[PDB]
Amino acid sequence: GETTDGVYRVMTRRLLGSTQVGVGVMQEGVFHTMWHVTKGAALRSGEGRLDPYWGDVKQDLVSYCGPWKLDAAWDGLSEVQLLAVPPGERAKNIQTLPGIFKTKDGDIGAVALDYPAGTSGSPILDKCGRVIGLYGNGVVIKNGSYVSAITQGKRE
Amino acid sequence: DMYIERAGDITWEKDAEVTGNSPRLDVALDESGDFSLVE
Numbered sequence: 001g002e003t004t005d006g007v008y009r010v011m012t013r014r015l016l017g018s019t020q021v022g023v024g025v026m027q028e029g030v031f032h033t034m035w036h037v038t039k040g041a042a043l044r045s046g047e048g049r050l051d052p053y054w055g056d057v058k059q060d061l062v063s064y065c066g067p068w069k070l071d072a073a074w075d076g077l078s079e080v081q082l083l084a085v086p087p088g089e090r091a092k093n094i095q096t097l098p099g100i101f102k103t104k105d106g107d108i109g110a111v112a113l114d115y116p117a118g119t120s121g122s123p124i125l126d127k128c129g130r131v132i133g134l135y136g137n138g139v140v141i142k143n144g145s146y147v148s149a150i151t152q153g154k155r156e
Numbered sequence: 157d158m159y160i161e162r163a164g165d166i167t168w169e170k171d172a173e174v175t176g177n178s179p180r181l182d183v184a185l186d187e188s189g190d191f192s193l194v195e
């Protein structure tokens with residue numbers, strides 16, 4: 001299949017027509033997405049197959065063909081870009097200053113941008129173009145709007 | 157059967173649309189990977 005680095009839509013033909021269930025990142029021959037997008041199922045890329053390699057429901061992350069490769073982190077000060085890939089629409093960069101999720105286990109950057117559920121797995125980037133996490137696991141605050149964590153995995 | 161389709165390169169765009177606020181929220185993460193607000 002196609003192994004070129006970049007951002008990819010994750011599609012299904014199981015439902016009506018072709019439906020976009022999410023997005024992911026291809027980097028160093030490894031496909032990275034959120035666990036809730038694929039539920040750990042195998043993926044097709046042209047005539048090729050991508051098998052899951054690592055995954056964790058609590059982190060809500062999964063990697064295919066190899067171990068998680070993304071290790072850049074938000075610096076806690078600068079604006080970042082969500083490279084949003086919405087269903088049926090062109091990839092678009094959106095710049096924002098992340099907020100914070102404060103947890104009993106430490107603080108995580110968070111992006112207050114509202115996109116359809118099928119946009120989950122879109123990458124959040126720093127100014128060097130490095131992926132600092134994936135968009136799509138968060139919370140719905142008082143006013144009904146959506147705030148996603150900047151979810152990043154560990155590079156072993 | 158899930159399949160992937162290329163959508164673009166991963167690069168920072170100068171003069172991208174700048175939006176979104178920066179809320180500081182107290183949150184909890186359960187064993188199922190669901191975040192919730194702590195109030």
Ligand SMILES: CC(=O)Nc1ccncc1C
Pocket residue numbers: 114115116117118119120136137138146
């Ligand atoms: C499950 C999920 O993350 N979906 C969602 C819900 C509301 N607004 C945006 C998104 C991405």
